[PDB]
Every structure is written in structure tokens, then in C-alpha cells.
């Protein structure tokens, strides 16, 4: 009976004003990717080789091609299209939370050439949104997005198996029957975009 039907976004147009957010979140996501590659012992390298862990995409976002940017941009746009297809409103309320996060402590005239030199290279440090809290309503909305990511995966998987006449996946079940550990990936993706919208000055409402 399990019949996942994620909302059709095929005819949604993202307003041009959200381009600012899509670019900012895509760059954050790329920097987070690079940090994780540095932490697993990968390093930049002009020419790609899986041997010795060299990754030529471990460079600033602005240098990436359209194609390489799309790895981040495509899912972000898909996420926004779902919200818009549900009739949710996405409004930029303020700027990127400048004051609240600014350290207002008295500043000493201390500088290091070591930091200065490091700033010439690619030195990714994506914001840690671990401190960032969602309202009760925004948590429920994030859970609905998480569920919809599962349903997108599930419908695609089901059509694949139906097309072949074979295959079986144990996670082809209703989202809520999943364990926390099984939900965690869709939960973290949903929560990530809601948290990044928030720190970027956006309010999602329904």
C-alpha cells in the first residue's frame, strides 16, 4: 500500500530574489564539504587522483564551473521549490544576523603575518550552526521537509524497481516507521536549510 507522492515541483519558478540565498548556501555547503575533506586527509591538487587523496575541487566556490556549482545549487533549488509548492512563504526579514553574532569585546591592535599569509590561500571555515535553534513550528516544518526528502527517494526507488521487475529495499516504508538513525540524513538536510535560512535573515511561514 506504501505510495509515496512527494509534491510535484516541475512547474515551480523560484523568484529571482532568492538567487542571493541559493548562492550563499551553495558556497557554505562547498566550504563545509572541503573542511570535511581536509579533516579526512584530502588536499587540493591541480589534476585529480584517488591515489594519495588529491581533490582539485578543494578550491574556492567562485573558481568552480557551472556544472560543479550545480552539485550544491540543484538540491538547494529542489528544497526551495518544495516549500513554494506547499504555498509556504519565504521572506528576507533582515540581514545575515550581523549584530547578534558580532563579538563586541574591546579589540587589541594585535595582528599575525601567519594569519595574513593563510588568508591568501583557500581556508574554509563554514559557520557551525550547532548553536542555532528552531521554533516549535519551524521544527515541525523541517520534519515535514525531511519526510518529503524520504518520499522523493522512495518514489524514485519504487519506479526503478517497478521498471526492472525486481529489487527490494527495506527502507521503502512510511517515513515515520523509520528509526531516528534511518531519519537522521533527511532530518539533518531539512534542519540545515532551515537553520541557514534563519541565520541568513529569512523567515519561512505557512
Amino acid at each position: 500500500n506504501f505510495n509515496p507522492q512527494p509534491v510535484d515541483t516541475s512547474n515551480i519558478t523560484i523568484p529571482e530574489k532568492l538567487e542571493y540565498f541559493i548562492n550563499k548556501y551553495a558556497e557554505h555547503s562547498h566550504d563545509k564539504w572541503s573542511m570535511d575533506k581536509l579533516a579526512n586527509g584530502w588536499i587540493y591538487g591541480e589534476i585529480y587522483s584517488d591515489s594519495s587523496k588529491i581533490q582539485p575541487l578543494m578550491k574556492p566556490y567562485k573558481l568552480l564551473s557551472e556544472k560543479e556549482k550545480e552539485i550544491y545549487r540543484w538540491p538547494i533549488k529542489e528544497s526551495l521549490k518544495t516549500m513554494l509548492a506547499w504555498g509556504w512563504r519565504i521572506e528576507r526579514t533582515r540581514e545575515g544576523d550581523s549584530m547578534a553574532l558580532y563579538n563586541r569585546t574591546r579589540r587589541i591592535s594585535q595582528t599575525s603575518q601567519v594569519d595574513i599569509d593563510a588568508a591568501h590561500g583557500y581556508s574554509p571555515r563554514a559557520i557551525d550552526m550547532s548553536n542555532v535553534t528552531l521554533s516549535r513550528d519551524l521544527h515541525a516544518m523541517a520534519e515535514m521537509m525531511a519526510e518529503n526528502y524520504h518520499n522523493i527517494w522512495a518514489k524514485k526507488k519504487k519506479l526503478e524497481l517497478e521498471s526492472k521487475g525486481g529489487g527490494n529495499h527495506p527502507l521503502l516504508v512510511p517515513y515515520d516507521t523509520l528509526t531516528a538513525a534511518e531519519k537522521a540524513k533527511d532530518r539533518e538536510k531539512a534542519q540545515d536549510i532551515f537553520k541557514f535560512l534563519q541565520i541568513s535573515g529569512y523567515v519561512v511561514s505557512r
Binding site: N103, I108, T111, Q113, D115, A119
Partner: protein, 326 residues
């Protein structure tokens, strides 16, 4: 007329700069009233000059502490600058001397406030209030630059608000006399001009950049480039990206686009018309430059007007070598 003073201001500065005054008073010429504050290097005492009856703030710097904190060159440079300059928005050194243990900087007594604590308490200044303080920095940098001094440490922390609510620059550790280019990395991360970070040399235009940062911080309540760590601040500065609060006026945004200009060759204050590109900007239209200089404008904020330990001066000269020029 105008040519007369700019030449004479410079001749008086150069004479004092090239031959600094030393030991222009001594400790026994002051009555010690009380300690006003404790600094990095010692205490600031309220003193009465015995002959004039004037009160002064005597900064006492323990030479050994200045050496230990590696502030030798900064302390010498600040005193050399302060005994040579004369401008309404620069703190007044009235006397300096040294003895076996201490350096003494006898400063004009100012029962004022600090720009840093006032701005942080108020949160942010209105554009008219920010403009009043900014005009004083513009005139102060016009003066310093006319002497070939690069200030290169502007920030709220270095500005006091005096008894009449005007600002005075209080710190000259980094200021340098230079014609053309210099390279030393100094300042505070949030106020560094991009050409400092690019580490290929810079000139007095870094001061006009810093003016942009201060005006932004005064009007917004936070500076234009910030981050949990310096590397990310340096990246944002050279990145050439800034975002203005939606409450900034169009005139303020235009001025700051031209002061926070990453290309020092297009930066206001650094073009053919020099300081006049700033003084004649629409954001300063209401500014009476001469009346600010003459301190005739009513300031928006007037600050509100057994602890003793004795000064022991050693029998033996401490750090004679390091402070020979003081």
C-alpha cells in the same frame, strides 16, 4: 592666508620631530592628588603642577614593564609624536620626563568618556551624530597626512570624548612618518585596509579606508567585516564585499562605497582632489568644516563629570639603553 598656517604648522612640527624635547619637568614639581586609573605599564595619577596650580593626568610607565610587554618602540614613538603635533583632536602632552624607574607623560586632564564604551552602551549612533565625530577624524587625518604621518590604528578604542563632547585621538604607538610606501603589519584585524593584508606595501590611503570602517561601525553599531577568527576577516576585507544595513541613507552608502574602496587608486582621500572629495561629499553637506575645527558646533553628548601606594624610584638606572631617546 591658508598657505601661511599649513606651512608654519609643518615647520613647528618638523623642528620638534627632528629635535624632541626631553625632561621638560620633574617629579618634585607636582603635588600627587590620587590615582585615576591603572594601565598596562603602571598608573595614571591626578597631579597639580605646583607653580601653575593646573591639574594634569600624569601617566607613569614602569620601564621594566614596558620592556617585558615588548612596547619599547611604540612607547618611544608615541611620545616623539605627542611632543611634536598640535591639533584640536589630538591629546595634549604638556610635559615628559624619565627617572631611574619610570617614564612620565604629563597629559592634559580630560574628565570625559571613551568612544568605545559609549558606542557599545548606546548601540549605534544616528547619522548626524556619527557625522559630527567623523568630521573631526577627517580634519585630524588631513593634519597628520600634511606632516607625512600615517596614523594606521583608527578604531573607537583609540578615541576619547572630551569635556565638550569632541573626540581626541589618544594612541600614537603605530603612527609613522613616511613619504610614499611602508610595509609594517599593524592595526587591529577589523580595521586593516586590503593593501595591508596583500603585504606588498601601502601608503596613507589606509587611513581613509579605516575612516570608512569607523563611520560604518558608528552608524551600524558593528563593523563591516567580522568573523570568529582573523583569517576569515582578512578574506572578507580583500574579497571586496560589504553589505550596508537597510537603515543607512543613500548618501552614507555612496560615501562608504568610495572609502571602503578595495582599490586604493580609486579611494576617496587618495585622488587628485585629496581630502576635498570627502569634505564635499553629499553626506557631509550639512558639515561646517571651519566651525568643527574651531569647536563651535554643539556636541550631541557631554560626558558626566586608603587606595594610595607611593611612587618608589630606584637608586639604580633601569633600562637606560632602551629609553635613552625618551
Amino acid at each position: 592666508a591658508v598657505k601661511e598656517f599649513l606651512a608654519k604648522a609643518k615647520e613647528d612640527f618638523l623642528k620638534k620631530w627632528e629635535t624632541p624635547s626631553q625632561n621638560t619637568a620633574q617629579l618634585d614639581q607636582f603635588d600627587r592628588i590620587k590615582t585615576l586609573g591603572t594601565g598596562s605599564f603602571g598608573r595614571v595619577m591626578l597631579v597639580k603642577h605646583k607653580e601653575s596650580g593646573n591639574h594634569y593626568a600624569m601617566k607613569i610607565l614602569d620601564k621594566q614593564k614596558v620592556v617585558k610587554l615588548k612596547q619599547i618602540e611604540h612607547t618611544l614613538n608615541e611620545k616623539r609624536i605627542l611632543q611634536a603635533v598640535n591639533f584640536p583632536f589630538l591629546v595634549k602632552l604638556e610635559f615628559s620626563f624619565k627617572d631611574n624607574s619610570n617614564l612620565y607623560m604629563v597629559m592634559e586632564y580630560v574628565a570625559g568618556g571613551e568612544m568605545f564604551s559609549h558606542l557599545r552602551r548606546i548601540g549605534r549612533f544616528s547619522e548626524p551624530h556619527a557625522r559630527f565625530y567623523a568630521a573631526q577624524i577627517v580634519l585630524t587625518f588631513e593634519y597628520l597626512h600634511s606632516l607625512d604621518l600615517i596614523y594606521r590604528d583608527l578604531k573607537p578604542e583609540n578615541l576619547l570624548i572630551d569635556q565638550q563632547g569632541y573626540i581626541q585621538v589618544t594612541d600614537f604607538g603605530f603612527a609613522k612618518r613616511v613619504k610614499g610606501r611602508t610595509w609594517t603589519l599593524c592595526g587591529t584585524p577589523e580595521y586593516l585596509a586590503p593593501e595591508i593584508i596583500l603585504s606588498k606595501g601601502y601608503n596613507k590611503a589606509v587611513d581613509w579606508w579605516a575612516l570608512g570602517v569607523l563611520i560604518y561601525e558608528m552608524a551600524a553599531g558593528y563593523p563591516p567585516f567580522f568573523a570568529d577568527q582573523p583569517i576569515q576577516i582578512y578574506e572578507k576585507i580583500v574579497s571586496g564585499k560589504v553589505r550596508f544595513p537597510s537603515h543607512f541613507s543613500s548618501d552614507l552608502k555612496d560615501l562608504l562605497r568610495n572609502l571602503l574602496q578595495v582599490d586604493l587608486t580609486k579611494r576617496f582621500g587618495n585622488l587628485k582632489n585629496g581630502v576635498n572629495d570627502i569634505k564635499n561629499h553629499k553626506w557631509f553637506a550639512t558639515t561646517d568644516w571651519i566651525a568643527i575645527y574651531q569647536r563651535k558646533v554643539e556636541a550631541p553628548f557631554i560626558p558626566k563629570f586608603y587606595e594610595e601606594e607611593e611612587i618608589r624610584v630606584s637608586i639604580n638606572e633601569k633600562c637606560g639603553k632602551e629609553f635613552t631617546e625618551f
